[PDB]
C-alpha cells in the first residue's frame, strides 16, 4: 500500500518533549485520528512492531502513538503525577493540540488509564471513541462522571487478567459501550491475540 509513517517523535507538551510515532493513509487524508497510549512495560514501539499503526493507517485512519512521560523515548520528561493518582485531564488535551489530531479515538491500556480517564471526563472534552484495555484508576472516577460521558466505548480485556473484571465493574457505567472479552488472553491481551484484537478494533472504528 501507500501508507506513510513518521516518527518525528517530538512535540512540546506543557514544556517538555515527548516522542511519538505516526502512520497515516499516504494520500494525506484520513476519516479521523486515533491516539494510542501504552502500558508501563511498553511504548509506542510496541504498537509499531505489533502492526497496529500500519493496520489502522491502511484502513483510512491517522494513527499516532506517543511515549508517556518518563517512558520510552520520553524518558527525560517528568510525569505530571505519581503512579497512584490521576494525571491532569488537560495533559492529553495539550498532546492532541500539539499534533493537531482533532477529537480522537483514545486507545488506553493499563497504566495510561491515569491519563486517559481524566481526559475522557474533562469539561467540553467529548471524544469520538474510547477503547480502554484494563486501565488503572477506573475507581477514581465516580459513577456520576462516567454516566455523563456519551462517547462510544469498546471495553477490551483478557479473561485471564484479574484487572479485567475489576475495571469492567466501573467502566460498564459508561452509557454507550460494548465489551470485547479475549478468551485465553492476559493483561496485555492485544499482544496475546493480535488478530482478534485488530479485527475487533477495526470493526469498532468502522461503526463511528
PDB file of C-alpha atoms in Angstrom:
ATOM      1  CA  UNK A   1       0.000   0.000   0.000  1.00  0.00           C
ATOM      2  CA  UNK A   2       0.970   3.681   0.210  1.00  0.00           C
ATOM      3  CA  UNK A   3       0.995   4.149   3.983  1.00  0.00           C
ATOM      4  CA  UNK A   4       3.304   6.933   5.193  1.00  0.00           C
ATOM      5  CA  UNK A   5       4.847   6.642   8.644  1.00  0.00           C
ATOM      6  CA  UNK A   6       6.939   9.162  10.510  1.00  0.00           C
ATOM      7  CA  UNK A   7       8.428   9.286  13.966  1.00  0.00           C
ATOM      8  CA  UNK A   8       9.302  12.961  14.167  1.00  0.00           C
ATOM      9  CA  UNK A   9       8.667  11.675  17.688  1.00  0.00           C
ATOM     10  CA  UNK A  10       8.908  15.126  19.172  1.00  0.00           C
ATOM     11  CA  UNK A  11       6.285  17.647  20.165  1.00  0.00           C
ATOM     12  CA  UNK A  12       6.379  20.133  23.014  1.00  0.00           C
ATOM     13  CA  UNK A  13       3.737  19.405  25.612  1.00  0.00           C
ATOM     14  CA  UNK A  14       3.473  21.611  28.690  1.00  0.00           C
ATOM     15  CA  UNK A  15       7.165  22.490  28.426  1.00  0.00           C
ATOM     16  CA  UNK A  16       8.513  19.007  27.743  1.00  0.00           C
ATOM     17  CA  UNK A  17       9.412  16.990  24.680  1.00  0.00           C
ATOM     18  CA  UNK A  18       7.502  13.784  24.047  1.00  0.00           C
ATOM     19  CA  UNK A  19       8.309  11.146  21.462  1.00  0.00           C
ATOM     20  CA  UNK A  20       5.637   9.963  19.025  1.00  0.00           C
ATOM     21  CA  UNK A  21       5.317   7.518  16.126  1.00  0.00           C
ATOM     22  CA  UNK A  22       2.753   8.110  13.394  1.00  0.00           C
ATOM     23  CA  UNK A  23       1.214   6.328  10.429  1.00  0.00           C
ATOM     24  CA  UNK A  24      -1.334   7.768   8.022  1.00  0.00           C
ATOM     25  CA  UNK A  25      -3.072   6.872   4.691  1.00  0.00           C
ATOM     26  CA  UNK A  26      -0.433   8.432   2.476  1.00  0.00           C
ATOM     27  CA  UNK A  27      -2.837  10.453   0.368  1.00  0.00           C
ATOM     28  CA  UNK A  28      -2.798  12.624   3.464  1.00  0.00           C
ATOM     29  CA  UNK A  29      -6.500  12.153   4.122  1.00  0.00           C
ATOM     30  CA  UNK A  30      -7.998  10.140   6.992  1.00  0.00           C
ATOM     31  CA  UNK A  31     -11.506   9.716   8.457  1.00  0.00           C
ATOM     32  CA  UNK A  32     -10.224  10.777  11.874  1.00  0.00           C
ATOM     33  CA  UNK A  33      -7.303  10.338  14.253  1.00  0.00           C
ATOM     34  CA  UNK A  34      -6.575   7.556  16.738  1.00  0.00           C
ATOM     35  CA  UNK A  35      -4.332   8.239  19.716  1.00  0.00           C
ATOM     36  CA  UNK A  36      -2.689   5.166  21.260  1.00  0.00           C
ATOM     37  CA  UNK A  37      -1.299   5.168  24.786  1.00  0.00           C
ATOM     38  CA  UNK A  38       0.621   2.316  26.447  1.00  0.00           C
ATOM     39  CA  UNK A  39       1.277   0.145  29.494  1.00  0.00           C
ATOM     40  CA  UNK A  40       4.226   0.678  31.832  1.00  0.00           C
ATOM     41  CA  UNK A  41       6.185  -2.210  30.288  1.00  0.00           C
ATOM     42  CA  UNK A  42       5.626  -0.954  26.743  1.00  0.00           C
ATOM     43  CA  UNK A  43       5.640   2.109  24.475  1.00  0.00           C
ATOM     44  CA  UNK A  44       4.743   3.409  21.026  1.00  0.00           C
ATOM     45  CA  UNK A  45       7.341   0.967  19.704  1.00  0.00           C
ATOM     46  CA  UNK A  46       5.193  -1.935  20.846  1.00  0.00           C
ATOM     47  CA  UNK A  47       2.273  -0.742  18.685  1.00  0.00           C
ATOM     48  CA  UNK A  48       4.607  -0.311  15.713  1.00  0.00           C
ATOM     49  CA  UNK A  49       6.036  -3.831  15.986  1.00  0.00           C
ATOM     50  CA  UNK A  50       2.583  -5.289  16.562  1.00  0.00           C
ATOM     51  CA  UNK A  51       1.483  -3.740  13.270  1.00  0.00           C
ATOM     52  CA  UNK A  52      -1.338  -1.685  14.756  1.00  0.00           C
ATOM     53  CA  UNK A  53      -0.248   1.731  13.467  1.00  0.00           C
ATOM     54  CA  UNK A  54       0.190   0.294   9.957  1.00  0.00           C
ATOM     55  CA  UNK A  55      -3.121  -1.604  10.081  1.00  0.00           C
ATOM     56  CA  UNK A  56      -5.054   1.471  11.178  1.00  0.00           C
ATOM     57  CA  UNK A  57      -3.377   3.639   8.550  1.00  0.00           C
ATOM     58  CA  UNK A  58      -4.314   1.390   5.626  1.00  0.00           C
ATOM     59  CA  UNK A  59      -7.889   1.322   6.948  1.00  0.00           C
ATOM     60  CA  UNK A  60      -8.100   5.084   6.438  1.00  0.00           C
ATOM     61  CA  UNK A  61      -7.112   6.437   9.867  1.00  0.00           C
ATOM     62  CA  UNK A  62      -4.317   8.671  11.115  1.00  0.00           C
ATOM     63  CA  UNK A  63      -2.613   6.652  13.855  1.00  0.00           C
ATOM     64  CA  UNK A  64      -0.486   8.326  16.499  1.00  0.00           C
ATOM     65  CA  UNK A  65       1.231   6.524  19.354  1.00  0.00           C
ATOM     66  CA  UNK A  66       3.175   8.522  21.922  1.00  0.00           C
ATOM     67  CA  UNK A  67       5.572   7.616  24.703  1.00  0.00           C
ATOM     68  CA  UNK A  68       4.246   8.777  28.065  1.00  0.00           C
ATOM     69  CA  UNK A  69       6.429  10.943  30.377  1.00  0.00           C
ATOM     70  CA  UNK A  70       9.424   9.057  31.750  1.00  0.00           C
ATOM     71  CA  UNK A  71       8.980   6.029  29.480  1.00  0.00           C
ATOM     72  CA  UNK A  72      10.217   5.008  26.032  1.00  0.00           C
ATOM     73  CA  UNK A  73      11.943   7.842  24.188  1.00  0.00           C
ATOM     74  CA  UNK A  74      10.224  10.315  26.509  1.00  0.00           C
ATOM     75  CA  UNK A  75      12.450   9.229  29.390  1.00  0.00           C
ATOM     76  CA  UNK A  76      13.641  12.730  30.209  1.00  0.00           C
ATOM     77  CA  UNK A  77      10.114  14.184  30.504  1.00  0.00           C
ATOM     78  CA  UNK A  78       8.682  14.346  34.046  1.00  0.00           C
ATOM     79  CA  UNK A  79       5.325  12.760  34.814  1.00  0.00           C
ATOM     80  CA  UNK A  80       2.609  15.260  35.876  1.00  0.00           C
ATOM     81  CA  UNK A  81       1.534  12.865  38.652  1.00  0.00           C
ATOM     82  CA  UNK A  82       2.875   9.791  40.553  1.00  0.00           C
ATOM     83  CA  UNK A  83       1.618   6.246  39.990  1.00  0.00           C
ATOM     84  CA  UNK A  84      -1.285   6.146  42.403  1.00  0.00           C
ATOM     85  CA  UNK A  85      -3.113   9.240  41.273  1.00  0.00           C
ATOM     86  CA  UNK A  86      -4.811  10.782  38.269  1.00  0.00           C
ATOM     87  CA  UNK A  87      -2.863  12.988  35.890  1.00  0.00           C
ATOM     88  CA  UNK A  88      -4.404  16.305  34.758  1.00  0.00           C
ATOM     89  CA  UNK A  89      -7.076  15.771  32.113  1.00  0.00           C
ATOM     90  CA  UNK A  90      -5.519  18.742  30.346  1.00  0.00           C
ATOM     91  CA  UNK A  91      -2.342  16.781  29.616  1.00  0.00           C
ATOM     92  CA  UNK A  92      -3.768  14.739  26.745  1.00  0.00           C
ATOM     93  CA  UNK A  93      -5.628  17.825  25.512  1.00  0.00           C
ATOM     94  CA  UNK A  94      -2.224  19.507  25.073  1.00  0.00           C
ATOM     95  CA  UNK A  95      -0.986  16.369  23.300  1.00  0.00           C
ATOM     96  CA  UNK A  96      -3.919  16.447  20.866  1.00  0.00           C
ATOM     97  CA  UNK A  97      -3.406  20.180  20.264  1.00  0.00           C
ATOM     98  CA  UNK A  98       0.304  19.911  19.505  1.00  0.00           C
ATOM     99  CA  UNK A  99      -0.268  17.174  16.911  1.00  0.00           C
ATOM    100  CA  UNK A 100      -3.471  18.809  15.634  1.00  0.00           C
ATOM    101  CA  UNK A 101      -5.306  15.480  15.611  1.00  0.00           C
ATOM    102  CA  UNK A 102      -8.734  16.915  16.319  1.00  0.00           C
ATOM    103  CA  UNK A 103     -11.130  14.911  18.586  1.00  0.00           C
ATOM    104  CA  UNK A 104      -9.523  11.443  18.609  1.00  0.00           C
ATOM    105  CA  UNK A 105     -10.379   7.874  19.482  1.00  0.00           C
ATOM    106  CA  UNK A 106      -8.194   7.102  22.501  1.00  0.00           C
ATOM    107  CA  UNK A 107      -6.873   3.557  22.980  1.00  0.00           C
ATOM    108  CA  UNK A 108      -5.845   3.289  26.615  1.00  0.00           C
ATOM    109  CA  UNK A 109      -4.352   0.171  28.167  1.00  0.00           C
ATOM    110  CA  UNK A 110      -3.241  -0.400  31.755  1.00  0.00           C
ATOM    111  CA  UNK A 111      -1.027   2.408  33.118  1.00  0.00           C
ATOM    112  CA  UNK A 112      -2.327   5.021  30.664  1.00  0.00           C
ATOM    113  CA  UNK A 113      -5.642   4.925  32.484  1.00  0.00           C
ATOM    114  CA  UNK A 114      -4.237   7.625  34.760  1.00  0.00           C
ATOM    115  CA  UNK A 115      -4.013   9.945  31.737  1.00  0.00           C
ATOM    116  CA  UNK A 116      -6.955   8.894  29.573  1.00  0.00           C
ATOM    117  CA  UNK A 117      -9.745   8.771  32.155  1.00  0.00           C
ATOM    118  CA  UNK A 118      -9.309  12.359  33.422  1.00  0.00           C
ATOM    119  CA  UNK A 119      -9.245  13.489  29.769  1.00  0.00           C
ATOM    120  CA  UNK A 120     -12.339  11.458  28.829  1.00  0.00           C
ATOM    121  CA  UNK A 121     -14.135  13.277  31.647  1.00  0.00           C
ATOM    122  CA  UNK A 122     -12.724  16.775  31.097  1.00  0.00           C
ATOM    123  CA  UNK A 123     -15.207  19.661  30.545  1.00  0.00           C
ATOM    124  CA  UNK A 124     -16.215  20.020  26.901  1.00  0.00           C
ATOM    125  CA  UNK A 125     -13.955  17.110  26.064  1.00  0.00           C
ATOM    126  CA  UNK A 126     -16.294  14.888  24.084  1.00  0.00           C
ATOM    127  CA  UNK A 127     -14.303  12.248  22.219  1.00  0.00           C
ATOM    128  CA  UNK A 128     -15.434  10.173  19.188  1.00  0.00           C
ATOM    129  CA  UNK A 129     -14.447   6.894  20.817  1.00  0.00           C
ATOM    130  CA  UNK A 130     -12.695   5.323  23.788  1.00  0.00           C
ATOM    131  CA  UNK A 131     -11.015   1.929  23.916  1.00  0.00           C
ATOM    132  CA  UNK A 132      -9.886   1.015  27.456  1.00  0.00           C
ATOM    133  CA  UNK A 133      -7.850  -2.169  27.913  1.00  0.00           C
ATOM    134  CA  UNK A 134      -7.902  -2.925  31.639  1.00  0.00           C
ATOM    135  CA  UNK A 135      -6.931   0.655  32.637  1.00  0.00           C
ATOM    136  CA  UNK A 136      -5.818   1.538  36.155  1.00  0.00           C
ATOM    137  CA  UNK A 137      -7.522   4.240  38.251  1.00  0.00           C
ATOM    138  CA  UNK A 138     -11.009   3.329  36.989  1.00  0.00           C
ATOM    139  CA  UNK A 139     -12.242   3.505  40.586  1.00  0.00           C
ATOM    140  CA  UNK A 140     -11.078   7.122  40.888  1.00  0.00           C
ATOM    141  CA  UNK A 141     -13.837   8.343  38.575  1.00  0.00           C
ATOM    142  CA  UNK A 142     -17.290   8.353  40.182  1.00  0.00           C
ATOM    143  CA  UNK A 143     -20.438   6.890  38.628  1.00  0.00           C
ATOM    144  CA  UNK A 144     -21.845  10.370  38.040  1.00  0.00           C
ATOM    145  CA  UNK A 145     -18.930  11.348  35.789  1.00  0.00           C
ATOM    146  CA  UNK A 146     -18.928   8.039  33.894  1.00  0.00           C
ATOM    147  CA  UNK A 147     -22.675   8.263  33.242  1.00  0.00           C
ATOM    148  CA  UNK A 148     -22.136  11.750  31.802  1.00  0.00           C
ATOM    149  CA  UNK A 149     -19.801  10.505  29.051  1.00  0.00           C
ATOM    150  CA  UNK A 150     -21.634   9.930  25.788  1.00  0.00           C
ATOM    151  CA  UNK A 151     -18.596   8.804  23.785  1.00  0.00           C
ATOM    152  CA  UNK A 152     -18.782   5.235  22.369  1.00  0.00           C
ATOM    153  CA  UNK A 153     -16.574   2.758  24.209  1.00  0.00           C
ATOM    154  CA  UNK A 154     -15.125  -0.653  23.417  1.00  0.00           C
ATOM    155  CA  UNK A 155     -14.188  -2.296  26.713  1.00  0.00           C
ATOM    156  CA  UNK A 156     -11.469  -4.815  25.894  1.00  0.00           C
ATOM    157  CA  UNK A 157      -9.692  -7.237  28.249  1.00  0.00           C
ATOM    158  CA  UNK A 158      -8.354 -10.782  28.580  1.00  0.00           C
ATOM    159  CA  UNK A 159     -10.324 -13.272  30.671  1.00  0.00           C
ATOM    160  CA  UNK A 160      -7.052 -14.326  32.342  1.00  0.00           C
ATOM    161  CA  UNK A 161      -6.484 -10.781  33.598  1.00  0.00           C
ATOM    162  CA  UNK A 162      -7.740 -10.117  37.161  1.00  0.00           C
ATOM    163  CA  UNK A 163      -7.875  -6.394  36.347  1.00  0.00           C
ATOM    164  CA  UNK A 164     -10.247  -7.188  33.501  1.00  0.00           C
ATOM    165  CA  UNK A 165     -13.280  -7.948  35.658  1.00  0.00           C
ATOM    166  CA  UNK A 166     -12.370  -5.326  38.268  1.00  0.00           C
ATOM    167  CA  UNK A 167     -12.022  -2.344  35.929  1.00  0.00           C
ATOM    168  CA  UNK A 168     -15.096  -3.508  33.980  1.00  0.00           C
ATOM    169  CA  UNK A 169     -17.291  -3.048  37.059  1.00  0.00           C
ATOM    170  CA  UNK A 170     -16.548   0.667  36.833  1.00  0.00           C
ATOM    171  CA  UNK A 171     -16.250   1.102  33.095  1.00  0.00           C
ATOM    172  CA  UNK A 172     -19.628  -0.532  32.427  1.00  0.00           C
ATOM    173  CA  UNK A 173     -21.100   2.676  33.854  1.00  0.00           C
ATOM    174  CA  UNK A 174     -20.278   4.269  30.509  1.00  0.00           C
ATOM    175  CA  UNK A 175     -23.670   4.844  28.785  1.00  0.00           C
ATOM    176  CA  UNK A 176     -22.594   3.684  25.324  1.00  0.00           C
ATOM    177  CA  UNK A 177     -20.289   0.674  25.477  1.00  0.00           C
ATOM    178  CA  UNK A 178     -19.625  -2.767  24.004  1.00  0.00           C
ATOM    179  CA  UNK A 179     -17.424  -5.439  25.557  1.00  0.00           C
ATOM    180  CA  UNK A 180     -14.732  -7.469  23.787  1.00  0.00           C
ATOM    181  CA  UNK A 181     -13.506 -10.244  26.073  1.00  0.00           C
ATOM    182  CA  UNK A 182     -10.464 -12.011  24.662  1.00  0.00           C
ATOM    183  CA  UNK A 183     -10.502 -15.639  25.758  1.00  0.00           C
ATOM    184  CA  UNK A 184      -7.213 -17.123  26.886  1.00  0.00           C
ATOM    185  CA  UNK A 185      -5.534 -13.721  26.935  1.00  0.00           C
ATOM    186  CA  UNK A 186      -3.816 -11.933  29.807  1.00  0.00           C
ATOM    187  CA  UNK A 187      -3.394  -8.297  30.828  1.00  0.00           C
ATOM    188  CA  UNK A 188      -1.650  -7.219  27.577  1.00  0.00           C
ATOM    189  CA  UNK A 189      -4.338  -9.116  25.636  1.00  0.00           C
ATOM    190  CA  UNK A 190      -3.569  -7.271  22.378  1.00  0.00           C
ATOM    191  CA  UNK A 191      -0.153  -8.956  22.413  1.00  0.00           C
ATOM    192  CA  UNK A 192      -1.554 -12.418  23.130  1.00  0.00           C
ATOM    193  CA  UNK A 193      -4.175 -12.389  20.366  1.00  0.00           C
ATOM    194  CA  UNK A 194      -3.169  -9.811  17.684  1.00  0.00           C
ATOM    195  CA  UNK A 195      -5.667 -10.902  15.021  1.00  0.00           C
ATOM    196  CA  UNK A 196      -8.657 -10.897  17.343  1.00  0.00           C
ATOM    197  CA  UNK A 197      -7.534  -7.534  18.754  1.00  0.00           C
ATOM    198  CA  UNK A 198      -7.045  -5.893  15.357  1.00  0.00           C
ATOM    199  CA  UNK A 199     -10.299  -7.273  13.952  1.00  0.00           C
ATOM    200  CA  UNK A 200     -12.391  -6.143  16.914  1.00  0.00           C
ATOM    201  CA  UNK A 201     -10.687  -2.755  16.841  1.00  0.00           C
ATOM    202  CA  UNK A 202     -11.295  -2.125  13.135  1.00  0.00           C
ATOM    203  CA  UNK A 203     -14.884  -3.352  13.383  1.00  0.00           C
ATOM    204  CA  UNK A 204     -15.421  -0.854  16.213  1.00  0.00           C
ATOM    205  CA  UNK A 205     -13.810   2.119  14.446  1.00  0.00           C
ATOM    206  CA  UNK A 206     -15.971   1.412  11.398  1.00  0.00           C
ATOM    207  CA  UNK A 207     -19.190   1.996  13.306  1.00  0.00           C
ATOM    208  CA  UNK A 208     -18.258   5.520  14.403  1.00  0.00           C
TER     209      UNK A 208
END
